[PDB]
């Protein structure tokens, strides 16, 4: 896995990947999620609080399908300045995509984001139909994958390269051993099982490649054992394969240092050739997410961490400690 999965990855993407492999196991990159979608507002807040920016900022294509975008629309993916200005200042770019779909075949998504859903409790959209020409699902799926591809191509033209983490947490709770009704995926892209899921991943990978997109480092998000191998199988059957994945990510909320080491070490053992990343973290209902240095010293040597915004966001005290830990790379420390 020393070279990127994309055989035609461009100069700058190969350079970013080389840097990540040099960081790996020595320090951990800081990161922060957008406030919802297309900004670096939370990274900015961390800078106001600590004097330092997170090294990585993640943007979400969640609302790509909303109509009437523009400078006084609700959102505007056509303006890539929130991303390019981050890169101009030396930050690293991360991208993800909560793949919202219309709630049903008769629903027009609203300019304010209404009319969208992401799993079967919210939409009739079936994963197994997304790849079948002639279905309403396939028409929307191809139109929005094209819209996202086209934004990424504009980013590429402007010199941007990015971590790309689509179709995440695919297995959800579907690996629950008992087979109870709540043992189900929580995003539509996993609700028709692992083979359809891997088909979706392969399809996007080959489509992006066919579109000439070569600025991405691909990150597949594993559920591991969902915290308990006693009652969950792991999600190895959902892994899209070495030729389609550069980095393995794991999303953990409210987890202690030793428990993070358990998660990191298990994934590292099953994916020996891949870097393992803490792709999402944050507080949960009752507990904080472990201090980063404490987790690192417990053995959880993630490539990077990225907390979520909102109710999940770690406290100001948490961030002040973390951004001053020498093992944590901040934006001003990537290159000096």
List CB contacts of 315: < 8 A, sequence separation 6 or more. 283, 288
Do 102 and 118 meet the contact criterion of CB atoms below 8 Å apart?
Answer: no
Burial of 8 (0-12, 13-18, 19+ CB in 10 A): exposed
Q: And the tokens for 50?
A: 């600590």
Beta-bridge partners for 216: 162
Q: And the tokens for 328?
A: 């944590």
Catalytic residues: 169, 280
Q: Cα–chain-centroid distance for residue 102?
A: 21
Classify residue 119 by its DSSP letter: S
List CB contacts of 67: < 8 A, sequence separation 6 or more. 108, 109, 110, 111
- Alpha-carbon span 307 to 313, nearest angstrom: 6
- Alpha-carbon span 191 to 178, nearest angstrom: 17
Pair type for strands 101-102 and 116-117: antiparallel
Measure CA of the first residue to CA of the last residue in the chain; give whole Å.
Answer: 28
Classify residue 7 by its DSSP letter: T
Q: And the tokens for 23?
A: 């960081």
Q: And the tokens for 203?
A: 């399809």
- Alpha-carbon span 42 to 10, nearest angstrom: 29
Pair type for strands 162-166 and 216-222: parallel
Q: How was this structure determined?
A: X-ray
DSSP 144-183: HHHHHHHHHHHHHHTT--EEEEES-STTTTTTBTT--TT-
- Alpha-carbon span 109 to 62, nearest angstrom: 12
In the chain, where does DSSP find H-type helix?
11-23, 41-50, 81-88, 127-130, 136-157, 194-210, 257-270, 292-297, 316-323, 331-334
- Alpha-carbon span 111 to 39, nearest angstrom: 18
DSSP 288-303: PPPPHHHHHHTT---S
Do 276 and 303 meet the contact criterion of CB atoms below 8 Å apart?
Answer: yes
- Alpha-carbon span 253 to 247, nearest angstrom: 20
Do 104 and 123 meet the contact criterion of CB atoms below 8 Å apart?
Answer: yes
Q: And the tokens for 67?
A: 């109509």
Burial of 260 (0-12, 13-18, 19+ CB in 10 A): buried
- Rounding to the nearest 10 degrees, give the CA dihedral for residues 320, 325, 329, 332: 60
CATH code given to domain 11-333: 3.20.20.80
Q: And the tokens for 266?
A: 């298990």
Cα-based angle 187, 189, 190 (whole degrees, multiple of 5): 75
Report in angstroms the alpha-carbon separations of 197 from 23, 122, 186, 236.
31, 19, 13, 12
Pair type for strands 28-29 and 305-307: unpaired
- Domain boundaries of the chain, sorted by first residue: 11-333
Q: Reported resolution in A? A: 1.7
- 3-state secondary structure at position 197: helix
């Amino acid at each position: 896995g020393v070279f990127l999965a994309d055989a035609s990855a461009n100069d700058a993407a190969k350079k970013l990947y080389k840097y990540l492999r040099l960081v790996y196991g020595n320090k951990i990159l800081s990161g922060m999620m957008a406030h919802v979608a297309w900004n670096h507002d939370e990274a900015d807040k961390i800078h106001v609080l600590t004097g330092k920016y997170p090294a990585i900022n993640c943007y979400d294509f969640i609302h790509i399908a909303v109509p009437n975008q523009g400078s006084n629309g609700w959102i505007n993916y056509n303006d890539i300045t929130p991303v390019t200005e981050w890169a101009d200042a030396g930050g690293i770019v991360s991208l993800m995509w909560h793949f919202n779909v219309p709630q049903n075949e008769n629903t027009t998504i609203g300019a304010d984001g209404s009319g969208q859903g992401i799993n079967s409790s919210q939409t009739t959209f079936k994963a197994s139909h997304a790849l079948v020409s002639g279905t309403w699902e396939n028409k929307f799926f191809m139109e929005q994958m094209e819209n996202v591809a086209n934004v990424i191509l504009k980013l590429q033209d402007a010199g941007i390269v990015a971590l790309w983490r689509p179709f995440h947490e695919a297995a959800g709770n579907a690996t629950l051993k008992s087979g109870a009704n709540w043992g189900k995926a929580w995003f539509w892209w996993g609700e028709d099982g692992p083979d359809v899921y891997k088909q979706l991943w392969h399809t996007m990978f080959n489509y992006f490649s066919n579109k000439g997109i070569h600025n991405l480092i691909w990150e597949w998000t594993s559920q591991n054992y969902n915290g308990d191998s006693d009652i969950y199988n792991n999600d190895d059957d959902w892994y899209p394969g070495d030729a389609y994945v550069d980095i393995i990510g794991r999303d953990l909320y409210g987890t202690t240092a030793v428990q993070q080491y358990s998660e990191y070490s298990q994934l590292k053992g099953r994916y020996p050739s891949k870097m393992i990343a803490l792709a999402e973290c944050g507080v949960n209902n009752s507990t904080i997410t472990a201090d980063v240095e404490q987790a690192w010293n417990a053995g959880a040597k993630w490539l990077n961490f990225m907390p979520w915004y909102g109710e999940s966001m770690p406290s100001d005290e948490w961030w002040t400690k973390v951004m001053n830990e020498n093992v944590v790379i901040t934006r001003d420390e990537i290159n000096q």
